């Protein structure tokens with residue numbers, strides 16, 4: 116059994132939103148004891164709903180769990196700004212527990228903002244070491260969701276790319292950075308390098324030509 | 327007031343063993359179903375194990391069966407988890423949760439790696455650059471260190487605004503951090519910029535001045 120949830124959702128403060136949890140194997144039922152937990156900054160978890168309906172003590176009335184469709188659902192009636200968190204769901208399959216991938220929920224507390232991207236070439240000092248680390252910095256983007264894709268000579272570089280996960284900023288915006296590692300030999304063989312960051316449909320591509 | 331606090335996580339070499347603890351407060355362990363859950367670097371949640379109350383069954387994730395053992399210590403109001411033929415896959419923040427995951431502990435990190443190493447700092451300068459906003463972004467690559475943390479600063483506090491330090495990244499048993507600064511094209515190259523990095527563990531102190539490419 117696989118448990119699927121929406122990647123991300125975005126609401127504005129005061130609106131009602133619904134997050135769902137689908138079961139690979141079949142209809143979610145009462146005996147899967149649908150569970151909902153929230154994850155806040157600095158990996159702070161707290162249980163919201165248990166047993167498909169039951170609100171943990173202390174959790175505000177705003178959150179509700181239920182079954183709608185062949186799925187388990189969490190509705191946040193009149194979503195508040197402090198509700199921008201990650202929501203995970205868990206289902207019991209009479210032996211084990213299966214957690215879904217989590218839903219990055221966004222409550223717009225400020226205008227949408229595009230990422231400030233910048234690509235750095237590999238330093239001299241580094242190439243000496245037979246290493247070539249291309250750094251792509253992604254900044255002041257809001258919502259906190261980005262997709263990074265790397266291209267070497269127009270071909271999508273399928274590997275050697277590691278990407279950090281979004282992290283808040285004091286202005287409650289987010290950052291991330293991606294890395295592209297190659298050997299100094301690899302690097303020589305190519306002349307066009309590109310880091311393309313997509314955010315809410317709009318793709319910003321910062322490139323560089325080596326030769 | 328219920329309190330959970332796990333301890334025991336440390337670096338460990340692949341194939342090594344560990345034993346984590348979860349001390350409970352606010353309730354009596356015996357009559358409470360407790361679980362172990364792990365959050366990976368990918369920021370994904372995974373069920374590790376559950377032990378039912380009364381004196382009932384204990385269930386294990388397929389990814390954990392045979393290698394990990396859960397134990398209760400009702401006498402000390404402690405929950406234990408033994409980890410034995412450790413794999414790269416097992417590196418994560420481990421947490422214990424109460425019945426139906428209402429209360430959670432703060433987590434304990436277990437890193438399955440090779441060994442301690444001071445960082446290789448690299449300065450990042452723009453490639454024969456321009457100035458869009460009459461603003462230039464400089465940086466610093468803090469590479470191949472172990473274990474975490476690292477302290478990056480710029481002109482040692484002088485530069486505070488325009489600083490973006492990115493979370494670490496672990497690839498071949500070693501971390502990779504990156505830091506940056508944005509400055510008007512007035513300050514650099516006219517004035518110098520230095521990234522100050524300090525690796526506590528290793529008692530490493532390095533300063534890299536960012537000069538033109």
Ligand SMILES: O=C(O)CN(CC(=O)O)C[C@H](Cc1ccc(NC(=S)NCCO)cc1)N(CC(=O)O)CC(=O)O
Nearest residue numbers: 147148149150165166207209210359376378379425426
């Ligand atoms: O809490 C859990 O992790 C498991 N929960 C599911 C839930 O409460 O959401 C389910 C659990 C009931 C429960 C207990 C055991 C099994 N599996 C058995 S008997 N397998 C037989 C193997 O030979 C299934 C369900 N609890 C139900 C409840 O809380 O009312 C009682 C308990 O936790 O002891």
Ligand SMILES: [In+3]
Nearest residue numbers: 148359425426
């Ligand atoms: In139960």
